[PDB]
Each structure stands twice: as C-alpha cells, then as structure tokens.
Design an enzyme around this catalytic site. Structure first.
Site, PDB file in Angstrom:
ATOM      1  N   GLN A  36       1.198  10.596   7.832  1.00  0.00           N
ATOM      2  CA  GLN A  36       1.720   9.456   7.080  1.00  0.00           C
ATOM      3  C   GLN A  36       3.051   9.789   6.371  1.00  0.00           C
ATOM      4  OE1 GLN A  36      -1.602   8.794   4.249  1.00  0.00           O
ATOM      5  NE2 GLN A  36      -1.701  11.000   4.208  1.00  0.00           N
ATOM      6  N   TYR A  69      -8.692   5.634 -12.176  1.00  0.00           N
ATOM      7  CA  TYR A  69      -9.398   5.608 -10.947  1.00  0.00           C
ATOM      8  C   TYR A  69     -10.175   6.940 -10.731  1.00  0.00           C
ATOM      9  CZ  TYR A  69      -9.743   5.293  -5.813  1.00  0.00           C
ATOM     10  OH  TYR A  69     -10.162   5.374  -4.518  1.00  0.00           O
ATOM     11  N   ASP A  94      -5.302  14.904  -3.699  1.00  0.00           N
ATOM     12  CA  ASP A  94      -4.467  15.238  -4.847  1.00  0.00           C
ATOM     13  C   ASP A  94      -5.269  15.981  -5.862  1.00  0.00           C
ATOM     14  OD1 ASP A  94      -6.026  12.960  -6.455  1.00  0.00           O
ATOM     15  OD2 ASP A  94      -5.054  12.005  -4.776  1.00  0.00           O
ATOM     16  N   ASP A 145     -10.310  15.334   9.484  1.00  0.00           N
ATOM     17  CA  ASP A 145     -10.711  13.965   9.493  1.00  0.00           C
ATOM     18  C   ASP A 145     -12.115  13.835   8.871  1.00  0.00           C
ATOM     19  OD1 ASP A 145     -11.176  11.340   9.962  1.00  0.00           O
ATOM     20  OD2 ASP A 145     -10.774  11.455  12.133  1.00  0.00           O
ATOM     21  N   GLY A 146     -12.280  12.914   7.918  1.00  0.00           N
ATOM     22  CA  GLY A 146     -13.553  12.719   7.226  1.00  0.00           C
ATOM     23  C   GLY A 146     -14.569  12.167   8.197  1.00  0.00           C
ATOM     24  N   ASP A 164     -12.453   8.478  -1.264  1.00  0.00           N
ATOM     25  CA  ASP A 164     -11.194   8.265  -2.014  1.00  0.00           C
ATOM     26  C   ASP A 164     -10.074   8.286  -0.971  1.00  0.00           C
ATOM     27  OD1 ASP A 164      -8.970   8.188  -3.720  1.00  0.00           O
ATOM     28  OD2 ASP A 164      -9.114  10.302  -4.357  1.00  0.00           O
ATOM     29  N   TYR A 233      -1.269  -0.420  -9.295  1.00  0.00           N
ATOM     30  CA  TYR A 233      -1.876  -0.901  -8.067  1.00  0.00           C
ATOM     31  C   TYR A 233      -1.543  -2.387  -7.950  1.00  0.00           C
ATOM     32  CZ  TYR A 233      -4.642   3.436  -7.010  1.00  0.00           C
ATOM     33  OH  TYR A 233      -5.158   4.692  -6.668  1.00  0.00           O
TER      34      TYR A 233
HETATM   35  C1  LIG Z   1      -4.064  10.400  -2.092  1.00  0.00           C
HETATM   36  S1  LIG Z   1      -5.766   9.726  -2.101  1.00  0.00           S
HETATM   37  C2  LIG Z   1      -5.387   8.116  -2.930  1.00  0.00           C
HETATM   38  C3  LIG Z   1      -4.844   8.287  -4.332  1.00  0.00           C
HETATM   39  C4  LIG Z   1      -5.956   8.344  -5.362  1.00  0.00           C
HETATM   40  N1  LIG Z   1      -6.496   9.736  -5.531  1.00  0.00           N
HETATM   41  C5  LIG Z   1      -5.802   9.055  -0.397  1.00  0.00           C
HETATM   42  C6  LIG Z   1      -6.140  10.156   0.597  1.00  0.00           C
HETATM   43  O1  LIG Z   1      -6.934   9.695   1.721  1.00  0.00           O
HETATM   44  C7  LIG Z   1      -6.640  10.556   2.801  1.00  0.00           C
HETATM   45  N2  LIG Z   1      -7.192  10.115   4.094  1.00  0.00           N
HETATM   46  C8  LIG Z   1      -6.795   9.045   4.861  1.00  0.00           C
HETATM   47  N3  LIG Z   1      -7.498   8.948   5.994  1.00  0.00           N
HETATM   48  C9  LIG Z   1      -8.386  10.013   5.956  1.00  0.00           C
HETATM   49  C10 LIG Z   1      -9.383  10.471   6.828  1.00  0.00           C
HETATM   50  N4  LIG Z   1      -9.658   9.867   8.022  1.00  0.00           N
HETATM   51  N5  LIG Z   1     -10.106  11.548   6.522  1.00  0.00           N
HETATM   52  C11 LIG Z   1      -9.828  12.157   5.354  1.00  0.00           C
HETATM   53  N6  LIG Z   1      -8.912  11.813   4.441  1.00  0.00           N
HETATM   54  C12 LIG Z   1      -8.210  10.728   4.789  1.00  0.00           C
HETATM   55  C13 LIG Z   1      -5.092  10.569   2.689  1.00  0.00           C
HETATM   56  O2  LIG Z   1      -4.548  11.653   3.408  1.00  0.00           O
HETATM   57  C14 LIG Z   1      -4.840  10.675   1.192  1.00  0.00           C
HETATM   58  O3  LIG Z   1      -4.675  12.017   0.709  1.00  0.00           O
HETATM   59  C1  LIG Z   2       1.524 -10.058  -9.030  1.00  0.00           C
HETATM   60  N1  LIG Z   2       2.427  -9.003  -9.480  1.00  0.00           N
HETATM   61  C2  LIG Z   2       2.148  -7.676  -9.138  1.00  0.00           C
HETATM   62  O1  LIG Z   2       1.095  -7.269  -8.626  1.00  0.00           O
HETATM   63  C3  LIG Z   2       3.287  -6.720  -9.418  1.00  0.00           C
HETATM   64  C4  LIG Z   2       4.311  -6.794  -8.300  1.00  0.00           C
HETATM   65  O2  LIG Z   2       3.699  -6.568  -7.039  1.00  0.00           O
HETATM   66  C5  LIG Z   2       3.127  -5.325  -7.021  1.00  0.00           C
HETATM   67  C6  LIG Z   2       3.028  -4.670  -5.802  1.00  0.00           C
HETATM   68  C7  LIG Z   2       2.464  -3.415  -5.774  1.00  0.00           C
HETATM   69  C8  LIG Z   2       2.009  -2.838  -6.949  1.00  0.00           C
HETATM   70  C9  LIG Z   2       2.089  -3.509  -8.155  1.00  0.00           C
HETATM   71  C10 LIG Z   2       2.655  -4.768  -8.197  1.00  0.00           C
HETATM   72  O3  LIG Z   2       2.699  -5.422  -9.436  1.00  0.00           O
HETATM   73  C11 LIG Z   2       3.468  -9.396 -10.362  1.00  0.00           C
HETATM   74  C12 LIG Z   2       4.582  -9.992  -9.820  1.00  0.00           C
HETATM   75  C13 LIG Z   2       5.606 -10.378 -10.655  1.00  0.00           C
HETATM   76  C14 LIG Z   2       5.511 -10.180 -12.021  1.00  0.00           C
HETATM   77  C15 LIG Z   2       4.404  -9.564 -12.580  1.00  0.00           C
HETATM   78  C16 LIG Z   2       3.382  -9.180 -11.733  1.00  0.00           C
END
Ligand SMILES: C[S@@H](CCCN)C[C@H]1O[C@@H](n2cnc3c(N)ncnc32)[C@H](O)[C@@H]1O
Ligand SMILES: CN(C(=O)[C@@H]1COc2ccccc2O1)c1ccccc1
Ligand SMILES: C[S@@H](CCCN)C[C@H]1O[C@@H](n2cnc3c(N)ncnc32)[C@H](O)[C@@H]1O
Lengths: 290, 269
Positions: A36, A69, A94, A145-146, A164, A233
């Site tokens: 990715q 989270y 992470d 891979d999970g 996660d 998010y």
């Molecule tokens: C970084 S974590 C999200 C942020 C909140 N801690 C998301 C992780 O999911 C992993 N991921 C995605 N697909 C898979 C699979 N198939 N297997 C294991 N891990 C995965 C990816 O590499 C990120 O590190």
């Molecule tokens: C609805 N909205 C949101 O979700 C904002 C912008 O879009 C996002 C996309 C990804 C992550 C966070 C985000 O925060 C919003 C839009 C305009 C003003 C205030 C809030």
C-alpha cells in the site's frame, strides 16, 4: 511526493464531496510499500495533531487522538473476557492496540500479524510512543497475511481476536468476508471474544447491519457495536463490533472493570462509564444493537 | 468549487450551487447546495463556520431541545436565544407541556434565509405557541422579569446572571457548549463561571455531529435548583408520544452523553 509546507489532502470515493486537509510541516516517509501507499509527516506545530500516518491516502494514526481507538479496541474486548491469556491482533502494525492489550496482567502472550512489514518499521522510527509494545517479549510480531494466519491456526487457540485493519477497499478486503470469520470463530476458545475495525454509522450503516447479521449467523452468539469519537476519521467517529462466541454474555457492561486494575488511571479515553456509553447508539442506528 | 472551513487544518465540502452569500448587519451568511453525490444537502454557514446541514441538523437540535426539557419537571415557558434557523424550536414544540416559547435571534436575515432554504427546520417559526423576535439576546434577558422561564436554551454562534434571574426556581439552562478536542480549556472555564454565577449544577453533554469541527460538540446543562442530577432524564422521552419521531435522542443517548472521555472527565466529575 508530499512536500514540506505543502498540504496533505484526504478525499475518497467511499465518502464523496467532503475533504480534510492538514498542512505538512515535515515529510518523514512517503513511498509505495509492497502492499500500500505509506505516508508519515509531522503536521503544523501550531496545530495539535503531531505526527500523522496515512495508508493509501487515508489517515490511520495521529499522535493527538491515537489513544481513542487503541484504548477502545484493547480494553472493551479484554474487559469483556473473564481471563484473557492468549490474544491475537490482525493488522495493528503500529503497535497501538498491542500496547493497550499488554497493560493487562492476565495476558501471557499476544500474537500480532500485519501484512506490511514497512508499517512496523516506520512506526518504530516515527511513532515510538505507539510502537514500544512491538519489542515486548510477551508479544510475537509477524509479517504476514492475517487470512492465511488464521486459516493455519488450530481450533481453540485464542481468548481474544482483535481485527485492527484498514478499509474493505484495500489489502484488508476479505477481513470483512466469510471463510475468514468462520476461521476466527474456530480459533477462538469457548469464552472467546472478537472485535473488529467497525466502520462509521454515518457512511457505512448498511455494511455494519450486514456484518453484524453475518457474524451472528456464522455462529457468534452475540454481536454489539461500540461507537467512539475519533476526530481525524471521516465524519468524527468509528465503531467496533464486539462479538462473543459463548451465548449469554453481555459485552455492553464490563465483566472485568478496568477501575480494579492498576493501570486504569493511565488511560486517556476509556473507563467503565465510556465502555457502557459506547453501546448507546443514536436512534437511527439503534437497530444495529436492538 | 469547494467551501473551505479553516491552524494548518481545513475541512471542505464541494459546492453544487450557491444559494445565498452576503454580509448581514451582523455576520457573513452563506447558504449552498452541496454535492448531490454526497449526503449533506443544503448547508448554511455563518462567519465561515458550518452551522446547519440538512443531513445532520437533527442531532444538535434534538440533544439541546430534549436534554433540557426532559430534565425539567414540567416545562411550560421556554426561551431560545439565537436559534434563528428554527431547529431547536421545532424540538421544543414537540413537548405537550410547552404553552409558549419565545425565540430571540439578533439576525433576522438568518430567519428569512431559513424559511427560504430550510423549510423542514424553519416551519416551527410560524407556530402559534411561538413568538419570534429579532434582537440581541443580552438586551432581551436584561429586560425580562425574574422567574419568567422554566427552560432557557442558548443556541448561538451580567448575561449568565440575567439567565439565572429570569429562570424560575426549577429552571434549566442549556447552551452551545463547544468541542472537547478544540476548546477544552474554554469549557472548563465556562462550567466554573456558570456555577460561580449561581447555578447549582453544570454538566456537559457530548454529542456526535459529523459537520462540526472534529466531529463532536456538546452542551452545558445547568440547573438553577440545587440537588438536580441532569445526567439521568427526569421525564423520559419514551413515555411521550413523539419518542419514535426522533432520529438521534432517547433516554440511553441522554445518559450516555454525560459519560466523558477520561482526558475531559474533570468537566463533570
Ligand atoms: C495501521 S492499522 C490502522 C490504524 C489504527 N491502528 C491497519 C493495518 O492493517 C493491516 N492489514 C491490511 N490488510 C491486512 C491483512 N490481510 N492481514 C494483516 N494485516 C493487514 C495494514 O497493513 C495496516 O498496518
Ligand atoms: C463531514 N466533514 C468531515 O468528515 C470532515 C471532512 O471530511 C473528512 C474526510 C476524512 C476525514 C475527516 C473528515 O472530516 C466535515 C466537512 C466540512 C466541515 C466539517 C466537517
Ligand atoms: C445559526 S444558530 C446555531 C446553529 C445551530 N442551530 C446561531 C444563531 O445565534 C444567533 N446569535 C448570535 N449572537 C446572538 C445574540 N447576541 N443574540 C441573539 N442571537 C444571537 C446568530 O445570529 C445565529 O443565527
């Protein structure tokens, strides 16, 4: 190809016509990985966010709100289990969830399996406060891979599985799918609890209904969605489905309250009141939970 | 073709059509139709800050209107300060106990534009149980006799003493209470200053609002009468006949909304 003083912009087809933008004070990593696109940057120091990580253009972790989270996935699950000794994290590269799971003194061993080894590498380097856990001798951190990992796990291996992962759109697409969740049910012990990356009630409400029905049908006794406030998010929130293998278990009230454990005061979001509160959904979404 | 809201972070919604965009005697009012491929509908902003969208306005309007009225023993006379769009009023008027609501907003152009572009929200402005005034709320409460109102709702963009004074002994005040992510220091200061001014309890109720900065806002729920615990509903909405018309608020959400993240819990506990 982000540049310092430039802005990082997050748009996405899964959420059309809205965008979040953070000024970049300093690029720390920005490149394709085997699996990715990984971007890490220091955000505007006049703003509260600190270092930011994005995967394929989507923010995953920031210094300022990562604790929400990670604390909610780690504690809601483990505080719903009577004795969680062996734990599996799928994704979680992470190290945040692992950090929270290792707070618990009942935990003997936690396996973590993330498909992208560069995610672990970059978190060690640029998120030490999230990533410290990864070097714990109580953890075994694997790159893999999970999907394959769980298929090759024996029945009844884990007390808790925490999923996660990223979006359904990326390398995490089948971790919202069917042999996978049956495998998770199978590798759980009888009192097993699963929790997943749960998607938004504002953008993903149909997916949430579908996932929850199908988790129950694959053979989980109960499934309940916990909502939490995550300011970075899309739409400010995300939830996790908390699932019990065993019938007769009410995950919405903590089985083992954190207040009785010696780390409760180190947490910045979670406690028993937030745990119970997180299962109360707005009326338009309440049918998820009943 | 984007509306941008802004240190070093911005939040944008794509504009499909500009419906209104002018200074008012008091503030900059912008109204637009957002991307038809997204959910937000018509969007109103004041001084560059999103105030209302079709998709999510029910949240803040239900939480303010019902958290307060469901915490009062019998709310018959209600004052709304600000609230020119009509949405808090619409919620207030669902309650059978309400004989009369006065609404006072400084900006008549907001009322005008809401009747024009948000009719599902502003229909309430022409209810016979309501009186709508155009005027500054500070000067209004100053000119209001003691013990006029059961509930005062401050839905905005000497005062708190006037609010305390114009409320009856069982009075409830609620306000637009700001963000725990962006304004935590201001929330603590206001919650102290409102208690100091004379209110007996103040508790912050947190809510999920996707279009407000960082996705949450809250309201301070303040009781003139000592010994009142506003965090549990006094008159549960489930026992009233409109409970199922609501899209956000119910008794579980009411209770849940007063559970704050540990880092913020010192606001309430
Ligand atoms: C970084 S974590 C999200 C942020 C909140 N801690 C998301 C992780 O999911 C992993 N991921 C995605 N697909 C898979 C699979 N198939 N297997 C294991 N891990 C995965 C990816 O590499 C990120 O590190
Ligand atoms: C609805 N909205 C949101 O979700 C904002 C912008 O879009 C996002 C996309 C990804 C992550 C966070 C985000 O925060 C919003 C839009 C305009 C003003 C205030 C809030
Ligand atoms: C748009 S409403 C808040 C949006 C959630 N319904 C904010 C209103 O408060 C009014 N406002 C701002 N200051 C005052 C004063 N001093 N008095 C009355 N109304 C006020 C302002 O004109 C907005 O319409």
């Amino acid at each position: 190809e982000l540049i310092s003083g430039g802005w990082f912009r997050e748009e996405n087809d899964q959420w059309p016509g809205q965008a979040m933008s953070l000024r970049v004070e300093k690029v720390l990593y920005d490149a394709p990985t085997k699996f990715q696109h990984l971007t890490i940057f220091e955000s505007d120091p006049k703003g509260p966010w600190g270092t930011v990580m994005a995967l394929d253009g989507c923010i995953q972790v920031t210094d300022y709100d990562e604790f929400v989270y990670h604390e909610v996935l780690g504690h809601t699950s483990l505080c719903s289990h009577p004795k969680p000794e062996r734990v599996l994290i799928i994704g979680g590269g992470d190290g945040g969830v692992l950090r929270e799971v290792l707070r618990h003194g009942t935990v003997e061993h936690c396996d973590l399996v993330d498909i992208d080894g560069e995610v672990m590498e970059q978190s060690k380097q640029h998120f030490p406060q999230i990533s410290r856990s990864l070097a714990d001798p109580r953890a075994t951190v694997r790159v893999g891979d999970g999907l394959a990992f769980v298929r090759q796990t024996p029945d009844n291996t884990y007390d808790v599985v925490i999923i996660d992962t990223t979006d359904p759109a990326g390398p995490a697409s089948k971790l919202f799918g069917e042999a996978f969740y049956k495998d998770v049910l199978r590798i759980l012990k009888p009192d097993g609890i699963c929790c997943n990356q749960g998607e938004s009630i504002w953008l993903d409400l149909e997916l949430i209904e579908k996932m929850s029905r199908f988790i129950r049908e694959t053979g989980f006794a109960s499934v309940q969605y916990a909502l939490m406030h995550v300011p970075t998010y899309p739409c400010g929130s995300i939830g996790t489905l908390v699932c019990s293998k065993k019938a007769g278990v009410d995950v919405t009230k903590p089985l083992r309250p954190v207040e009785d454990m010696p780390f409760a005061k180190d947490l910045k979001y979670y406690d028993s009141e937030m745990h119970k509160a997180s299962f109360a959904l707005p009326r338009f979404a309440r049918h998820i939970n009943n």
